[PDB]
């Protein structure tokens, strides 16, 4: 994708930057739900995989008309005191490419119990002996804490940046901006 926009979280005493990036990713998801499309990607160029931090930057990649459209929408109403804007410009050359993947886990055993007892009509003990409590997977990935609107549930979403490649291939994106085959330029 040719054009990128960098929005920086303004340093704020009233909330930590994790909460601002949470609400920014959430309103980003709501704006991408309102526009649709699968050619709109995200990246976080302030990565730090030692302490698993997401930093303070948000880089959204698409075309020119999409970015200049997303500037003038009410998904930036009520937030523009708390973040700074950049300019939609071309990605420089040359840059590597990588992905943004959502990596969940089956770290809750109880959902797997409910699944195995709802499809098979087992008992609690058969589901307990089939899958033990050691199935919980630990993760060292950065995460964003979003809530739900209609049936409200607050969850952390882990973001994984993939390996740096030399060329990018075609592919879509979700409403979260996450990679489904399409890679974002890393710089």
């Amino acid at each position: 994708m040719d054009h990128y926009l960098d929005i920086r979280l303004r340093p704020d005493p009233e909330f930590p930057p994790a909460q601002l990036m949470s609400v920014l990713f959430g309103k980003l998801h709501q704006a991408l739900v309102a526009q649709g499309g699968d050619r709109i990607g995200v990246s976080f160029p302030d990565l730090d995989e030692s302490r698993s931090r997401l930093g303070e930057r948000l880089r959204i990649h698409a075309s020119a008309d999409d970015l200049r459209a997303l500037l003038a929408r009410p998904w930036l109403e009520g937030l523009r005191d708390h973040l700074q804007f950049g300019e939609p410009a071309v990605v420089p050359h040359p840059t590597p490419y990588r992905q943004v993947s959502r990596v969940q886990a089956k770290s809750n055993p109880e959902r797997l119990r409910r699944r195995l007892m709802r499809r098979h009509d087992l008992s609690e003990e058969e589901a307990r002996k089939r899958i033990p409590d050691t199935v919980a997977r630990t993760l060292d990935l950065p995460f964003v804490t979003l809530r739900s609107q209609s049936t409200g549930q607050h969850f952390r979403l882990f973001i994984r940046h993939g390996p740096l490649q030399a060329t990018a291939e075609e592919g879509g994106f979700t409403c979260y901006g996450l990679s489904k085959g399409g890679f974002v330029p890393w710089f």
């Binding site: 303004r10 009233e14 609400v23 309103k27």
Partner: protein, 293 residues
């Protein structure tokens, strides 16, 4: 002459506990029978409060008492130190009024900063402020709180009249009682953010609410003279002016700009600081607290 071993100031600008209610927009002038936001439990069991599915407006209501007599301590051992401090605040008041401080307090009243997480992401917030002289209303202010920014202290004629009322209260020339109602437009079925206890939510009797000290912390977010930076904006007035979120302390005592060293230089040694620092230390005396050995 040295500082007193005990020294205590009662707080001025007493806020109430801000009660939460819900309703639909353009019923804002009929918002007297609006039902309150009920906290409910759901599955670990967490208590959350949401707006009803036919309401998009969260209405918070509290009261504020501006009392005055901000220089006199509530307890003091030394009498000469007390007279020195009283005449020092007297020369501060005779130099300039409470107009800058009441202007900043009226600014923080104008924007809906007391809605902490209920202001972020709201499409439209409006603040109604009633100065209540007798049992009935005596003056009304209406503000678009999205118009007043959280970074700059502007000027407006209604805002200057509100600041003149607050400065008249702080000077002891009259008793000030304000009722602050705020409407926030979030949407249908969205969540609100009341204060949390020691997960449970703060509640007055069958109604979600915010702590009064939370509204008080939001109201004194006027400190724009800390020497580290100023591009972040105002913070709450504190000796060693710090914030719990960032984990860092401005007005560090290594620098000569905390509250205590400023007060010791001004009162004991008569080294009067810069006028913005004078505003800071008088704002800390309005904030109140326990000072001394």
């Amino acid at each position: 002459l040295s500082t007193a071993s005990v020294l205590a100031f009662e707080r001025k600008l007493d806020p109430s506990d801000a009660l939460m209610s819900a309703g639909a927009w353009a019923q804002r002038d009929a918002s007297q029978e609006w039902p309150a936001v009920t906290v409910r439990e759901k599955s670990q069991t967490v208590d959350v409060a949401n707006l009803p599915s036919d309401a998009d407006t969260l209405k918070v209501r509290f009261t504020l008492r501006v009392l005055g007599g901000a220089g006199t301590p509530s307890a003091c051992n030394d009498a000469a130190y007390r007279d020195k401090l009283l005449q020092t605040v007297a020369t501060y008041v005779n130099e300039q009024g409470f107009a800058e401080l009441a202007r900043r307090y009226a600014h923080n009243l104008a924007n809906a900063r007391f809605l902490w997480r209920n202001r972020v992401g709201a499409e439209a917030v409006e603040v109604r402020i009633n100065h209540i002289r007798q049992g009935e209303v005596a003056r009304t202010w209406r503000f678009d709180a999205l118009a007043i920014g959280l970074r700059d202290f502007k000027a407006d004629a209604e805002l200057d009249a509100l600041a003149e009322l607050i400065a008249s209260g702080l000077s002891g020339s009259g008793h000030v009682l304000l009722e602050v109602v705020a409407f926030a437009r979030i949407g249908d079925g969205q969540e609100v953010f009341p204060s949390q206890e020691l997960k449970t939510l703060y509640s007055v009797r069958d109604a979600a609410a915010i702590h009064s000290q939370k509204i008080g912390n939001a109201l004194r977010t006027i400190d724009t003279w800390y020497p580290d930076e100023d591009g972040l904006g105002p913070i709450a007035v504190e000796p060693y002016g710090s914030v719990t979120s960032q984990g860092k302390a401005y007005r560090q005592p290594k620098q000569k700009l905390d509250f205590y060293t400023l007060l010791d230089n001004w009162v004991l040694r008569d080294e009067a600081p810069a006028v913005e620092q004078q505003h800071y230390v008088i704002a800390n005396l309005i904030r109140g607290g326990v000072f001394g050995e």
